[PDB]
């Protein structure tokens, strides 16, 4: 490839996406090197590893990582690969561990993936460097429950990276003194399409998905959208009405969300009515692969496979003090709608698969896609909302910002 022509792949002012970004093999290897190996990725939620020694295995990019709670309750994230011949160190999806031993040749590790013992280094390795030969470690950082990692010892801080995005994440994560716990169990499915489609997207009529709606009723809206200043994040939401209530989450989960004690109070840590209770559904995407829907409350990582396939790891989060049966609702309603079986998300999948399939073709790959929807409709000072806010919510501004940061990541060797 080449610094110059990578850049020609996306025209921001004028809304052209070159479809090759979604398909190209070497381009993919660069994302892996210049996006994932340098940005903050979503490993899961704290609740999924309470006790010391609890682990769960996931991915940063296409590197399997082990995620382990330590004795000082810190969170260690090391590359799930023995450095001897590259056997997998941790082998279940989840569990508790006193230590870790590499099944192939004995090399033993501690709770934070430090090579602590080789059998008979007496006999052999005339002085072996244990530290050097431990797996690669990843910078871990936490945002109000969400676990994040980044390989780059030079990456900016997580708060910096996030920038004023923290604001919109607070809509789901900080609406109660007691934080938020993740309902246990993580659904996983495979969806042969580029990771960017999922992330960009998904469900972007921020006009059908109709039958999904008609499921939750027993028979032209106001809102805004935020584009991040720096790091390609972005969020989109409504203001007052059904949709959340009827349709997606039902009666109870909306009473809870909009009226009554838990929503007024608690939710007034946000220092804003409406910001707390006249909210309704909300998108939100934290570059590159972190996605969640405050109000519904599925969180996902998208994991890249091909440039042509992605895996979807999704769980659900509830306020940790929410009433029993309200937590229960979140559980049922979430899976009813935004799971792989869900009455909404079962369609988002069907789609992207076709999108990718088509791009097997020469002509399908030779003219750009249109992303010029609702240009220059942002002021960047809103009384209430930080960053770069559009006031008609039907725009591809957040999206443009996504591709634009992608472009910045793809063309830097250093940090801009």
């Amino acid at each position: 490839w080449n610094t110059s022509e990578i850049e020609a792949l996306f025209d921001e002012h004028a809304g052209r996406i070159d479809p090759r970004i979604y398909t190209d093999e070497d381009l993919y290897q660069l994302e892996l090197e210049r996006v994932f190996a340098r940005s903050w990725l979503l490993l899961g939620h704290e609740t999924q590893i309470r006790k010391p020694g609890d682990y769960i295995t996931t991915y940063m990019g296409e590197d399997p990582v082990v995620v382990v709670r330590q004795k000082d309750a810190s969170i260690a994230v090391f590359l799930n690969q023995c450095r001897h011949r590259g056997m997998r160190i941790c082998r279940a999806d989840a569990g508790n561990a006193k230590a870790f031993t590499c099944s192939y040749h004995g090399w033993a590790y501690d709770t934070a993936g430090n090579l602590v013992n080789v059998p008979y280094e007496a006999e052999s390795f005339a002085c072996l460097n244990k530290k050097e030969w431990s797996p690669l470690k990843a910078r871990v950082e936490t945002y109000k429950g969400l676990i994040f990692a980044n390989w780059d010892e030079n990456a900016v801080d997580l708060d910096t990276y996030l920038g004023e995005a923290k604001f919109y994440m607070d809509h789901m994560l900080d609406r109660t003194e007691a934080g938020t716990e993740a309902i246990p169990g993580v659904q996983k499915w495979v969806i042969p399409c580029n990771w960017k489609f999922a992330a960009e997207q998904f469900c972007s009529d921020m006009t059908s998905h109709l039958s999904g709606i008609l499921a939750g009723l027993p028979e032209p809206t106001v809102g805004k959208q935020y584009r991040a200043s720096w790091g390609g994040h972005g969020s989109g939401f409504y203001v007052g009405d059904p949709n959340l209530m009827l349709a997606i989450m039902g009666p109870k989960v909306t009473s809870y969300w909009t009226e009554g004690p838990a929503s007024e109070k608690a939710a007034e840590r946000l220092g804003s009515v409406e910001r707390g209770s006249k909210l309704m559904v909300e998108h939100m995407t934290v570059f590159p692969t972190c996605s969640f829907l405050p109000g519904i409350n599925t969180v996902r990582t998208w994991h890249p496979r091909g440039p042509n396939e992605v895996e979807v790891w999704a769980f659900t989060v509830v306020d940790a003090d929410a009433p029993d049966d309200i937590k229960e609702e979140f559980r049922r309603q979430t899976l009813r709608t935004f799971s792989a079986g869900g009455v909404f998300e079962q369609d988002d999948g069907e789609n992207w698969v076709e999108i990718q399939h088509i791009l097997r073709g020469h002509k399908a790959r030779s003219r750009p896609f249109n992303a010029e929807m609702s240009m220059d409709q942002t002021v960047d000072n809103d009384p209430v909302y930080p960053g770069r806010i559009s006031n008609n919510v039907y725009s591809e501004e957040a999206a443009r910002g996504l591709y634009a940061h992608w472009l910045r990541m793809m063309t830097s060797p250093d940090w801009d």
């Binding site: 082998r91 279940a92 999806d93 989840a94 569990g95 309902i183 246990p184 169990g185 993580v186 659904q187 996983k188 499915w189 495979v190 969806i191 042969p192 059908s208 109709l210 039958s211 999904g212 008609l214 499921a215 939750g216 895996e311 769980f315 659900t316 229960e328 559980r331 049922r332 979430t334 899976l335 009813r336 799971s339 792989a340 079986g341 009455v343 998300e345 079962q346 369609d347 999948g349 069907e350 698969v353």
Partner: protein
Amino acid sequence: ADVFLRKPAPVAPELQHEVEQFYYWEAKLLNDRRFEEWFALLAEDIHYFMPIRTTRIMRDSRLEYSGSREYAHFDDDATMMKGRLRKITSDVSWSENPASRTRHLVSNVMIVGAEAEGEYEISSAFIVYRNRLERQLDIFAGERRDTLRRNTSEAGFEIVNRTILIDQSTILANNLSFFF
């Protein structure tokens, strides 16, 4: 299991047939897209369950399935189902999505009675075969553990409990739009 720590047995064979024939029929409806008629088989206290499964270390096999207060693939009310039927019927009427080709192979059906006249407890095997649009194909297998109740319908039974034990870690297709 409970009910299956010990071998059934023996019944029937009029009974054995009667159950198998129920399932074969249920599969016919499912594969023929005859969905209105299928939902009609669910008892109004239907609990339709498919837990998420995890790859575990052999001593921890135990921890495989998600328990009942945790996230599932499926955990449906009569009311939630009623609602999925609305999604299906609604796609058929006003929508341009393509129809989906399924097969349900039903097999190792084992029957034990329960309390009430009335109600029987079942273990069966699986393979579902789903082809759709040109070349997509997924094959799923597993165990249905059902509670069936006798019934005055032409179908003869209604499904009060269904627990779907998939032989699948990560879900290998791209959606779960059909019904086991």
